[PDB]
Coordinates of C-alpha atoms in Angstrom, one line a residue:
Chain A
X805 CA 84.1 -37.4 -23.2
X806 CA 82.4 -40.7 -24.3
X807 CA 82.4 -38.8 -27.6
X808 CA 86.0 -37.8 -27.5
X809 CA 86.9 -41.5 -27.8
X810 CA 84.7 -41.5 -30.9
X811 CA 86.2 -38.2 -32.2
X812 CA 89.7 -39.7 -31.5
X813 CA 89.1 -43.2 -33.1
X814 CA 87.9 -41.6 -36.4
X815 CA 91.2 -39.7 -36.7
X816 CA 93.5 -42.5 -35.6
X817 CA 92.3 -44.1 -38.8
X818 CA 92.3 -41.0 -41.0
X819 CA 88.5 -41.2 -41.3
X820 CA 87.0 -38.0 -39.8
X821 CA 86.9 -35.0 -42.0
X822 CA 85.2 -32.3 -39.9
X823 CA 82.6 -31.6 -37.3
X824 CA 79.2 -30.1 -38.2
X825 CA 76.7 -27.9 -36.5
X826 CA 73.3 -29.6 -36.0
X827 CA 70.1 -28.2 -34.5
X828 CA 69.0 -31.7 -33.5
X829 CA 72.1 -33.5 -32.4
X830 CA 74.4 -33.4 -29.3
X831 CA 77.0 -33.7 -32.1
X832 CA 77.7 -34.8 -35.7
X833 CA 80.8 -35.8 -37.6
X834 CA 81.4 -36.2 -41.3
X835 CA 83.6 -39.2 -42.0
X836 CA 85.3 -40.0 -45.3
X837 CA 85.3 -43.7 -46.2
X838 CA 86.5 -44.8 -48.5
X839 CA 88.2 -42.1 -50.6
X840 CA 85.9 -39.1 -50.6
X841 CA 82.7 -41.0 -49.9
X842 CA 80.7 -39.4 -47.1
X843 CA 79.3 -41.2 -44.1
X844 CA 77.6 -39.5 -41.1
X845 CA 78.2 -40.1 -37.4
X846 CA 75.3 -38.4 -35.5
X847 CA 74.3 -38.6 -31.9
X848 CA 70.6 -37.5 -32.0
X849 CA 69.4 -34.7 -29.7
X850 CA 67.5 -36.7 -27.0
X851 CA 69.9 -39.7 -26.7
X852 CA 73.4 -39.3 -25.2
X853 CA 74.1 -43.0 -25.0
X854 CA 74.0 -43.8 -28.7
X855 CA 75.5 -42.8 -32.0
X856 CA 73.7 -43.3 -35.3
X857 CA 75.7 -44.2 -38.4
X858 CA 74.0 -43.0 -41.5
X859 CA 74.9 -42.9 -45.2
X860 CA 72.9 -41.0 -47.8
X861 CA 73.2 -42.0 -51.4
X862 CA 71.4 -40.2 -54.1
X863 CA 70.8 -42.0 -57.4
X864 CA 72.5 -40.0 -60.2
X865 CA 70.7 -38.3 -63.1
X866 CA 72.6 -40.8 -65.2
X867 CA 70.9 -43.7 -63.4
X868 CA 67.3 -43.0 -62.8
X869 CA 67.6 -42.4 -66.5
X870 CA 67.5 -46.2 -67.1
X871 CA 65.1 -47.0 -64.3
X872 CA 62.6 -44.5 -65.9
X873 CA 62.9 -46.4 -69.2
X874 CA 61.8 -49.7 -67.7
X875 CA 58.2 -50.7 -67.5
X876 CA 56.4 -50.1 -64.2
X877 CA 56.6 -53.9 -63.9
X878 CA 60.4 -54.0 -64.1
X879 CA 60.8 -51.0 -61.8
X880 CA 58.8 -52.7 -59.0
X881 CA 60.9 -55.8 -59.6
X882 CA 64.0 -53.6 -58.9
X883 CA 62.6 -51.9 -55.8
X884 CA 61.8 -55.3 -54.5
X885 CA 65.3 -56.6 -55.2
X886 CA 67.2 -53.7 -53.6
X887 CA 64.8 -54.1 -50.7
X888 CA 65.5 -57.8 -50.0
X889 CA 69.2 -57.2 -50.5
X890 CA 69.4 -54.4 -47.9
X891 CA 67.2 -56.1 -45.3
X892 CA 70.0 -58.7 -45.3
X893 CA 72.8 -56.3 -44.2
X894 CA 71.7 -55.8 -40.6
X895 CA 70.8 -52.2 -41.1
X896 CA 67.8 -49.9 -41.4
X897 CA 67.0 -48.1 -44.6
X898 CA 64.9 -45.5 -46.3
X899 CA 64.1 -45.8 -50.0
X900 CA 63.1 -42.8 -52.1
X901 CA 61.2 -44.1 -55.2
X902 CA 58.4 -41.8 -56.4
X903 CA 57.2 -43.6 -59.5
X904 CA 59.2 -46.6 -58.5
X905 CA 62.2 -44.7 -59.8
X906 CA 64.9 -44.7 -57.2
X907 CA 66.1 -41.1 -56.4
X908 CA 68.0 -41.8 -53.2
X909 CA 68.4 -44.4 -50.4
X910 CA 69.6 -44.0 -46.8
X911 CA 71.5 -46.7 -45.0
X912 CA 71.5 -46.5 -41.2
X913 CA 73.0 -48.4 -38.2
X914 CA 73.1 -47.3 -34.5
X915 CA 75.6 -48.4 -31.8
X916 CA 74.7 -48.0 -28.2
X917 CA 77.4 -47.3 -25.7
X918 CA 76.9 -50.5 -23.7
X919 CA 78.7 -51.9 -26.7
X920 CA 80.8 -49.1 -28.1
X921 CA 84.5 -49.8 -28.9
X922 CA 86.9 -48.7 -31.6
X923 CA 86.6 -52.2 -33.1
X924 CA 82.8 -52.1 -33.0
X925 CA 82.7 -48.6 -34.4
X926 CA 84.9 -49.1 -37.3
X927 CA 83.0 -52.3 -38.2
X928 CA 79.5 -50.7 -38.3
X929 CA 80.9 -47.9 -40.5
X930 CA 82.4 -50.5 -42.9
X931 CA 79.2 -52.5 -42.9
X932 CA 77.0 -49.6 -43.7
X933 CA 79.3 -48.9 -46.6
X934 CA 79.0 -52.5 -47.9
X935 CA 75.2 -52.4 -47.5
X936 CA 74.8 -49.3 -49.6
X937 CA 77.6 -50.5 -51.9
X938 CA 75.8 -53.6 -53.0
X939 CA 72.9 -51.4 -54.1
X940 CA 75.2 -49.2 -55.9
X941 CA 76.7 -52.2 -57.7
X942 CA 73.2 -53.5 -58.5
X943 CA 72.3 -50.3 -60.3
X944 CA 75.7 -50.3 -61.9
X945 CA 75.7 -53.9 -63.2
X946 CA 72.4 -53.1 -64.8
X947 CA 72.9 -49.6 -66.2
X948 CA 76.7 -49.3 -66.3
Chain B
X232 CA 101.9 -57.5 -24.8
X233 CA 99.1 -57.5 -27.3
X234 CA 101.8 -58.9 -29.6
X235 CA 102.9 -61.9 -27.5
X236 CA 99.2 -62.9 -27.0
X237 CA 98.5 -62.9 -30.7
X238 CA 101.6 -64.9 -31.2
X239 CA 100.9 -67.4 -28.5
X240 CA 97.3 -67.8 -29.5
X241 CA 98.3 -68.6 -33.1
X242 CA 101.1 -70.9 -31.8
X243 CA 98.5 -72.6 -29.6
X244 CA 96.5 -73.5 -32.6
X245 CA 99.3 -74.4 -35.0
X246 CA 98.2 -71.5 -37.1
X247 CA 101.7 -69.9 -36.7
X248 CA 104.4 -70.6 -39.2
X249 CA 107.1 -67.9 -38.8
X250 CA 107.6 -64.1 -38.9
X251 CA 109.1 -61.9 -41.6
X252 CA 110.6 -58.3 -41.9
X253 CA 107.8 -56.2 -43.2
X254 CA 109.4 -52.8 -43.5
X255 CA 106.0 -51.2 -43.3
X256 CA 104.6 -53.2 -40.4
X257 CA 105.3 -53.0 -36.7
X258 CA 105.1 -56.8 -37.0
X259 CA 104.0 -59.4 -39.4
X260 CA 103.3 -63.0 -38.4
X261 CA 102.5 -65.7 -41.0
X262 CA 99.7 -68.2 -40.4
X263 CA 99.0 -71.5 -42.1
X264 CA 95.3 -72.2 -42.2
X265 CA 94.3 -74.6 -43.2
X266 CA 97.1 -77.1 -43.8
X267 CA 99.5 -75.2 -46.1
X268 CA 97.2 -72.3 -46.9
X269 CA 98.8 -68.9 -46.4
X270 CA 97.3 -66.1 -44.3
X271 CA 99.0 -62.8 -43.1
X272 CA 98.6 -61.0 -39.8
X273 CA 100.0 -57.5 -40.1
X274 CA 100.2 -54.4 -37.9
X275 CA 100.6 -51.3 -40.0
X276 CA 103.2 -48.6 -39.3
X277 CA 101.1 -46.0 -37.6
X278 CA 98.6 -48.5 -36.1
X279 CA 99.6 -49.9 -32.7
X280 CA 96.0 -50.7 -31.8
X281 CA 95.2 -53.1 -34.6
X282 CA 96.0 -56.1 -36.7
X283 CA 95.1 -56.8 -40.3
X284 CA 94.3 -60.3 -41.4
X285 CA 95.0 -60.5 -45.2
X286 CA 94.8 -63.3 -47.6
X287 CA 95.7 -62.6 -51.2
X288 CA 95.0 -65.4 -53.7
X289 CA 96.3 -65.9 -57.2
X290 CA 94.0 -67.8 -59.6
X291 CA 95.9 -70.5 -61.5
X292 CA 96.9 -70.0 -65.1
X293 CA 94.6 -72.9 -66.1
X294 CA 91.7 -71.0 -64.5
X295 CA 92.6 -67.7 -66.0
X296 CA 92.4 -69.6 -69.2
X297 CA 88.8 -70.6 -68.6
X298 CA 87.8 -67.1 -67.9
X299 CA 89.7 -65.6 -70.8
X300 CA 88.1 -68.0 -73.2
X301 CA 84.6 -66.6 -72.3
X302 CA 83.1 -63.6 -74.1
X303 CA 83.5 -60.2 -72.4
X304 CA 79.9 -60.4 -71.4
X305 CA 80.2 -63.7 -69.6
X306 CA 83.3 -62.3 -67.9
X307 CA 81.8 -59.1 -66.7
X308 CA 78.9 -61.3 -65.4
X309 CA 81.5 -63.4 -63.5
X310 CA 83.3 -60.4 -61.9
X311 CA 79.9 -59.0 -60.7
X312 CA 79.1 -62.4 -59.2
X313 CA 82.3 -62.5 -57.1
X314 CA 81.9 -58.8 -56.1
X315 CA 78.4 -59.5 -54.8
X316 CA 79.6 -62.7 -53.1
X317 CA 82.5 -61.3 -51.2
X318 CA 80.7 -58.2 -50.2
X319 CA 78.4 -60.3 -48.0
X320 CA 81.2 -61.7 -45.9
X321 CA 81.8 -58.5 -43.9
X322 CA 85.3 -58.4 -45.3
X323 CA 87.2 -55.8 -47.4
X324 CA 88.6 -57.1 -50.7
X325 CA 90.3 -56.1 -53.9
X326 CA 90.0 -57.8 -57.3
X327 CA 92.8 -57.7 -59.9
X328 CA 91.3 -58.4 -63.3
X329 CA 93.3 -57.3 -66.4
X330 CA 90.6 -57.4 -69.1
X331 CA 88.0 -58.8 -66.7
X332 CA 90.1 -61.9 -66.4
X333 CA 90.5 -62.4 -62.6
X334 CA 94.2 -62.6 -61.8
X335 CA 94.2 -62.2 -58.1
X336 CA 91.8 -61.3 -55.3
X337 CA 92.7 -60.0 -51.9
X338 CA 90.4 -60.5 -48.9
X339 CA 91.1 -58.6 -45.7
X340 CA 89.5 -58.0 -42.2
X341 CA 91.0 -56.3 -39.3
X342 CA 90.7 -56.4 -35.5
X343 CA 91.4 -53.4 -33.1
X344 CA 92.9 -54.4 -29.8
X345 CA 89.9 -52.6 -28.4
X346 CA 88.1 -55.9 -28.8
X347 CA 90.9 -58.4 -29.5
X348 CA 90.6 -61.8 -27.9
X349 CA 91.5 -65.3 -28.9
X350 CA 87.9 -66.3 -29.6
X351 CA 87.8 -63.2 -31.9
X352 CA 91.2 -63.5 -33.5
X353 CA 90.6 -67.0 -34.6
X354 CA 87.0 -66.4 -35.8
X355 CA 88.2 -63.5 -37.9
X356 CA 90.9 -65.7 -39.5
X357 CA 88.4 -68.4 -40.3
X358 CA 85.9 -65.9 -41.8
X359 CA 88.6 -64.4 -44.0
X360 CA 89.1 -67.9 -45.2
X361 CA 85.5 -68.8 -46.0
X362 CA 85.2 -65.6 -48.0
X363 CA 88.2 -66.4 -50.3
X364 CA 87.2 -70.1 -50.2
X365 CA 83.8 -69.5 -51.6
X366 CA 85.3 -67.5 -54.4
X367 CA 87.7 -70.3 -55.1
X368 CA 84.7 -72.7 -55.3
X369 CA 83.0 -70.5 -57.9
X370 CA 86.0 -70.8 -60.1
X371 CA 86.5 -74.5 -59.5
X372 CA 82.8 -75.2 -60.0
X373 CA 82.8 -73.4 -63.3
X374 CA 86.2 -74.4 -64.6
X375 CA 87.0 -77.7 -62.8
Chain C
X964 CA 86.9 -74.1 -14.0
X965 CA 84.8 -73.3 -17.1
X966 CA 83.8 -76.9 -17.6
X967 CA 81.5 -76.8 -14.5
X968 CA 79.8 -73.6 -15.9
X969 CA 79.3 -75.0 -19.4
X970 CA 77.7 -78.0 -17.7
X971 CA 75.7 -75.9 -15.3
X972 CA 74.1 -73.9 -18.2
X973 CA 73.3 -76.8 -20.6
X974 CA 71.4 -78.5 -17.7
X975 CA 69.6 -75.2 -16.8
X976 CA 68.1 -75.3 -20.3
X977 CA 67.4 -79.0 -20.3
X978 CA 69.7 -79.4 -23.3
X979 CA 72.2 -81.7 -21.4
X980 CA 71.7 -85.4 -21.6
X981 CA 74.8 -87.2 -20.4
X982 CA 78.6 -87.5 -20.7
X983 CA 80.8 -90.1 -22.4
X984 CA 84.4 -91.4 -22.1
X985 CA 86.0 -89.8 -25.1
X986 CA 89.7 -90.7 -25.1
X987 CA 90.6 -87.6 -27.2
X988 CA 88.8 -84.9 -25.2
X989 CA 89.1 -83.5 -21.6
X990 CA 85.3 -83.6 -21.6
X991 CA 82.5 -84.6 -23.9
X992 CA 78.9 -83.7 -23.0
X993 CA 76.3 -84.9 -25.4
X994 CA 73.5 -82.4 -25.8
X995 CA 69.9 -82.8 -27.0
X996 CA 68.7 -79.9 -29.1
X997 CA 66.1 -79.8 -30.4
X998 CA 64.1 -82.6 -28.8
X999 CA 65.8 -85.8 -29.9
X1000 CA 68.4 -84.1 -31.9
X1001 CA 72.0 -84.8 -31.0
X1002 CA 74.8 -82.2 -30.7
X1003 CA 78.3 -82.8 -29.2
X1004 CA 80.3 -80.5 -27.0
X1005 CA 83.9 -81.6 -27.1
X1006 CA 87.3 -80.2 -25.8
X1007 CA 90.4 -81.6 -27.5
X1008 CA 92.7 -83.6 -25.2
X1009 CA 95.5 -80.9 -25.3
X1010 CA 93.4 -77.8 -25.3
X1011 CA 92.3 -75.7 -22.2
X1012 CA 90.8 -72.6 -23.6
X1013 CA 88.1 -74.0 -25.8
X1014 CA 85.2 -76.2 -26.7
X1015 CA 83.7 -77.5 -30.0
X1016 CA 80.1 -77.7 -30.9
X1017 CA 79.8 -80.5 -33.4
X1018 CA 76.7 -81.9 -35.1
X1019 CA 77.2 -85.1 -37.3
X1020 CA 74.3 -86.1 -39.6
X1021 CA 74.0 -89.1 -41.8
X1022 CA 71.7 -89.1 -44.8
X1023 CA 69.1 -91.8 -44.7
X1024 CA 69.7 -94.5 -47.3
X1025 CA 66.4 -93.5 -49.0
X1026 CA 67.6 -89.9 -49.6
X1027 CA 71.0 -91.2 -50.5
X1028 CA 69.1 -93.4 -52.9
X1029 CA 67.5 -90.4 -54.6
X1030 CA 70.8 -88.7 -55.1
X1031 CA 72.0 -92.0 -56.5
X1032 CA 69.2 -91.9 -59.0
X1033 CA 70.5 -88.6 -60.4
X1034 CA 73.1 -88.2 -63.1
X1035 CA 76.8 -87.6 -62.1
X1036 CA 76.3 -83.9 -63.1
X1037 CA 73.1 -83.4 -61.1
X1038 CA 75.1 -84.9 -58.2
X1039 CA 78.0 -82.6 -58.6
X1040 CA 75.5 -79.7 -58.8
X1041 CA 74.0 -80.8 -55.5
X1042 CA 77.3 -81.1 -53.7
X1043 CA 78.2 -77.6 -54.7
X1044 CA 74.9 -76.3 -53.4
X1045 CA 75.4 -77.7 -49.9
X1046 CA 79.0 -76.5 -50.0
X1047 CA 78.0 -72.9 -50.9
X1048 CA 75.1 -73.1 -48.4
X1049 CA 77.1 -74.1 -45.3
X1050 CA 80.0 -71.7 -46.0
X1051 CA 77.6 -68.9 -45.4
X1052 CA 76.8 -70.1 -41.9
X1053 CA 80.1 -69.3 -40.1
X1054 CA 80.6 -73.0 -39.2
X1055 CA 83.2 -75.5 -40.4
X1056 CA 82.1 -78.6 -42.2
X1057 CA 83.3 -82.1 -43.3
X1058 CA 81.5 -83.5 -46.4
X1059 CA 81.3 -87.2 -47.0
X1060 CA 80.3 -87.9 -50.6
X1061 CA 81.8 -91.1 -52.1
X1062 CA 80.8 -90.6 -55.8
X1063 CA 79.1 -87.3 -55.1
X1064 CA 76.4 -89.2 -53.2
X1065 CA 76.2 -87.5 -49.9
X1066 CA 76.8 -90.1 -47.1
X1067 CA 76.9 -87.7 -44.2
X1068 CA 77.9 -84.1 -43.4
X1069 CA 79.5 -82.6 -40.3
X1070 CA 79.2 -79.0 -39.1
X1071 CA 81.4 -77.7 -36.3
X1072 CA 82.0 -74.4 -34.5
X1073 CA 84.4 -73.5 -31.6
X1074 CA 84.2 -71.1 -28.6
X1075 CA 87.4 -69.9 -26.9
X1076 CA 86.8 -69.2 -23.2
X1077 CA 87.7 -65.5 -23.5
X1078 CA 84.4 -65.4 -25.4
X1079 CA 82.4 -68.0 -23.5
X1080 CA 79.1 -67.2 -21.7
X1081 CA 75.7 -68.8 -21.5
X1082 CA 74.2 -66.4 -24.1
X1083 CA 77.0 -67.2 -26.6
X1084 CA 77.1 -70.9 -26.0
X1085 CA 73.4 -71.3 -26.5
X1086 CA 73.8 -69.3 -29.7
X1087 CA 76.7 -71.2 -31.1
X1088 CA 74.6 -74.4 -30.6
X1089 CA 71.5 -73.0 -32.3
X1090 CA 73.6 -71.7 -35.2
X1091 CA 75.3 -75.1 -35.6
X1092 CA 71.8 -76.6 -35.7
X1093 CA 70.5 -74.1 -38.3
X1094 CA 73.5 -74.7 -40.6
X1095 CA 72.7 -78.4 -40.4
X1096 CA 68.9 -78.1 -40.6
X1097 CA 69.3 -76.1 -43.9
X1098 CA 71.1 -78.8 -45.7
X1099 CA 68.7 -81.4 -44.3
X1100 CA 65.7 -79.3 -45.7
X1101 CA 67.4 -78.9 -49.0
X1102 CA 67.7 -82.7 -49.2
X1103 CA 64.0 -83.3 -48.2
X1104 CA 62.6 -80.5 -50.4
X1105 CA 64.2 -82.3 -53.3
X1106 CA 63.6 -85.9 -52.2
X1107 CA 60.6 -85.9 -50.0
Chain D
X1235 CA 67.8 -55.1 -12.5
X1236 CA 67.7 -56.6 -16.0
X1237 CA 63.9 -56.1 -16.1
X1238 CA 64.5 -52.6 -14.8
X1239 CA 67.2 -51.9 -17.3
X1240 CA 65.1 -53.4 -20.1
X1241 CA 62.1 -51.2 -19.1
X1242 CA 64.5 -48.2 -19.0
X1243 CA 66.1 -49.0 -22.4
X1244 CA 62.8 -49.5 -24.3
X1245 CA 61.4 -46.2 -22.9
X1246 CA 64.5 -44.3 -23.9
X1247 CA 64.1 -45.3 -27.6
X1248 CA 60.3 -44.9 -27.8
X1249 CA 59.8 -48.6 -28.0
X1250 CA 58.2 -49.5 -24.7
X1251 CA 54.5 -49.3 -25.4
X1252 CA 53.2 -50.9 -22.3
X1253 CA 53.5 -53.7 -19.8
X1254 CA 50.8 -56.4 -19.6
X1255 CA 49.8 -59.1 -17.1
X1256 CA 51.0 -62.6 -18.1
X1257 CA 50.7 -65.5 -15.7
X1258 CA 53.4 -67.5 -17.6
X1259 CA 56.0 -64.7 -17.5
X1260 CA 58.0 -62.9 -14.9
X1261 CA 57.3 -59.7 -16.9
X1262 CA 56.0 -58.9 -20.4
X1263 CA 56.6 -55.7 -22.3
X1264 CA 54.8 -54.7 -25.5
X1265 CA 56.8 -52.9 -28.1
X1266 CA 55.8 -50.7 -30.9
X1267 CA 58.7 -50.9 -33.4
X1268 CA 58.6 -49.9 -36.2
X1269 CA 56.0 -47.3 -35.3
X1270 CA 52.7 -49.2 -35.2
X1271 CA 54.1 -52.7 -35.5
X1272 CA 54.1 -54.8 -32.3
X1273 CA 56.8 -56.9 -30.6
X1274 CA 56.8 -58.8 -27.3
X1275 CA 59.7 -58.8 -24.8
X1276 CA 59.1 -61.6 -22.3
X1277 CA 60.8 -63.3 -19.5
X1278 CA 59.6 -66.9 -19.4
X1279 CA 58.2 -67.7 -15.9
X1280 CA 60.6 -70.5 -15.0
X1281 CA 63.6 -68.8 -16.6
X1282 CA 65.8 -66.7 -14.2
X1283 CA 68.3 -65.6 -16.8
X1284 CA 66.6 -65.1 -20.1
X1285 CA 64.3 -62.9 -22.1
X1286 CA 62.3 -63.9 -25.2
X1287 CA 61.8 -61.5 -28.2
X1288 CA 58.7 -62.6 -30.0
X1289 CA 57.0 -61.3 -33.1
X1290 CA 53.7 -63.0 -34.0
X1291 CA 52.3 -62.4 -37.5
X1292 CA 48.9 -63.4 -38.9
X1293 CA 48.8 -64.1 -42.6
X1294 CA 45.9 -61.7 -43.5
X1295 CA 42.7 -63.5 -44.5
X1296 CA 43.0 -62.1 -48.0
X1297 CA 46.6 -63.1 -48.6
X1298 CA 46.0 -66.7 -47.8
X1299 CA 43.3 -66.5 -50.4
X1300 CA 46.2 -65.7 -52.6
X1301 CA 48.1 -68.8 -51.6
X1302 CA 44.8 -70.7 -51.3
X1303 CA 44.6 -70.5 -55.1
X1304 CA 48.1 -71.8 -55.8
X1305 CA 48.4 -75.5 -56.5
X1306 CA 49.8 -77.7 -53.8
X1307 CA 53.1 -77.8 -55.5
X1308 CA 53.3 -74.0 -55.9
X1309 CA 52.2 -73.7 -52.2
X1310 CA 54.9 -76.1 -51.0
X1311 CA 57.3 -74.2 -53.1
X1312 CA 56.4 -71.2 -51.0
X1313 CA 56.7 -72.9 -47.7
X1314 CA 60.2 -74.1 -48.4
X1315 CA 61.2 -70.6 -49.6
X1316 CA 59.9 -69.0 -46.5
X1317 CA 61.6 -71.7 -44.4
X1318 CA 65.0 -71.2 -46.1
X1319 CA 64.7 -67.5 -45.7
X1320 CA 63.9 -67.3 -42.0
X1321 CA 66.6 -69.9 -41.2
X1322 CA 69.1 -67.3 -42.5
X1323 CA 68.3 -64.7 -39.9
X1324 CA 69.6 -66.5 -36.8
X1325 CA 66.1 -66.7 -35.2
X1326 CA 64.0 -69.5 -34.1
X1327 CA 60.6 -69.6 -35.9
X1328 CA 57.3 -71.4 -36.1
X1329 CA 55.1 -71.7 -39.2
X1330 CA 51.3 -72.2 -39.1
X1331 CA 50.4 -73.5 -42.5
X1332 CA 47.2 -75.6 -42.4
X1333 CA 47.3 -77.0 -45.9
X1334 CA 50.6 -75.5 -46.9
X1335 CA 48.5 -72.3 -46.7
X1336 CA 50.4 -69.9 -44.4
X1337 CA 48.1 -69.0 -41.5
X1338 CA 50.6 -67.2 -39.3
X1339 CA 54.4 -67.1 -38.4
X1340 CA 56.3 -66.5 -35.2
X1341 CA 59.9 -65.2 -35.2
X1342 CA 61.8 -65.4 -31.9
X1343 CA 65.1 -65.0 -30.2
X1344 CA 66.5 -65.1 -26.7
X1345 CA 69.1 -63.1 -24.8
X1346 CA 70.6 -64.5 -21.7
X1347 CA 71.4 -62.0 -19.0
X1348 CA 74.9 -63.3 -19.6
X1349 CA 75.0 -61.1 -22.7
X1350 CA 72.3 -58.6 -22.1
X1351 CA 72.9 -54.9 -22.8
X1352 CA 71.0 -52.1 -24.6
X1353 CA 73.1 -52.4 -27.8
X1354 CA 72.4 -56.1 -27.7
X1355 CA 68.7 -55.9 -26.8
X1356 CA 67.8 -53.4 -29.5
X1357 CA 69.7 -55.3 -32.2
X1358 CA 67.9 -58.4 -31.3
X1359 CA 64.6 -56.6 -31.7
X1360 CA 65.5 -55.3 -35.1
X1361 CA 66.7 -58.6 -36.3
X1362 CA 63.5 -60.4 -35.3
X1363 CA 61.7 -57.7 -37.1
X1364 CA 63.8 -57.8 -40.3
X1365 CA 63.3 -61.5 -40.5
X1366 CA 59.6 -61.2 -40.1
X1367 CA 59.7 -58.3 -42.5
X1368 CA 61.3 -60.4 -45.3
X1369 CA 58.5 -63.0 -45.0
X1370 CA 55.9 -60.2 -45.1
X1371 CA 57.6 -58.6 -48.1
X1372 CA 57.7 -62.0 -49.9
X1373 CA 53.9 -62.4 -49.5
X1374 CA 53.3 -58.8 -50.6
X1375 CA 55.6 -58.9 -53.6
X1376 CA 53.6 -61.9 -54.9
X1377 CA 50.0 -61.1 -53.8
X1378 CA 50.3 -57.3 -53.3

């Protein structure tokens, strides 16, 4: 019921794309914002008073191409950059950089129900997008 | 009633100027913040639980001159600067740059009645302003 | 109604110092945060639903002397820096710079009663202070 | 009720590590967020409507050796940099830098019961951490 508001707000805005089975979640929705970009709305198993907004972004073959070319020095420099940048967007993140080559990066933000609202919901989603966007623009401005 | 509140709040601050027939919007007030600066308050057709605060800006012909003069590299560098700048204002935006010569840039944020208040309506207007204002300062700082 | 609460809270935190006969405001409580620092809480004469957190700061003649000692280009460069800095704080500001020699600077923020609460007020005050402190530290870091 | 809710919330998220006797506080919870990192949720003794979120950090002995070596100028360059950074996270902080050689740093924030809620409380905790994290990351990027 608290989740029907969620389910409803995502459709009122043409966001929601489909629900998804999930062995470790009371529920899970796959939102499309913007365009065909994919963002996840997951309410973890144990907690029923929160929703976690996640966005998984895998660095293309095309891109870790250039990051591989750089010296180990310049890679580190880049992992440090993307790191400071994201720790500025009010989100939590996970970086996947084996040899300091960035394969993927997850941007997350949770909203508890004490403060849930359509306005709040739609904001966090948009913010998580912008957080992961700057990183995508960083790689892009460097490597095209 | 959400509508008369928005309207009275804006009137209460002198932000209001007049309406206008937006054949796409349930309503469309026109604010003037600051002084003679033009900001739009729009409620999309389908949406009856939200207002959009948009502010499109056209860069003067004398400024588009400055940026057109520059090499393509210095231009692409400039567009990246403004993308990275705006993206940290928690606002949506859209740049119109012919051959990377910024023509116009639209900055937009939106409130859902779910969390609409005067304190919030006003703060959102002023934030949309600062975001398009700092982009204006980048242009004026570089081109006079 | 809300005036007695705003007053009650400032005093609860010590913050409050005294009041003063401002002919342009319903009330005007002069706060002291941090210790010895002066911030002003005003409420325009013809405004019920709101207060203003204002912090005026004049640049010592010494510091003003150092920015005097710079070129007219190094001065313009410095003005832009404080402009870009403050516009990222979500506060409004008035800049006083005769010939790009910073005289004083004013940072303000307003709270509309449908958003008022102790938590929020205390925050808006601290944020106004941080916006101010930043420019002051920029000044000192450059000129002792 | 607030202490009770706070205890309850921390435990629901895995944060609440343990409570600890403090003569100068109504209560005092110890948090382990991220997983082995520690934070202090405290209600000042003489405060009936506020909680303090504190994160103390000791500049490791062999990281101050790093900044011991830097010339005074270079050290001061670092103190300003860490001061401008932290003042951007909307947190109160305290720097222990003996000879401009960073000893330890405290990042803090308050939440008045006026605005207390789980969504609010947890965000505060993550913001205090992120700020303290950026300073740590700054030290590590430089000295490893």
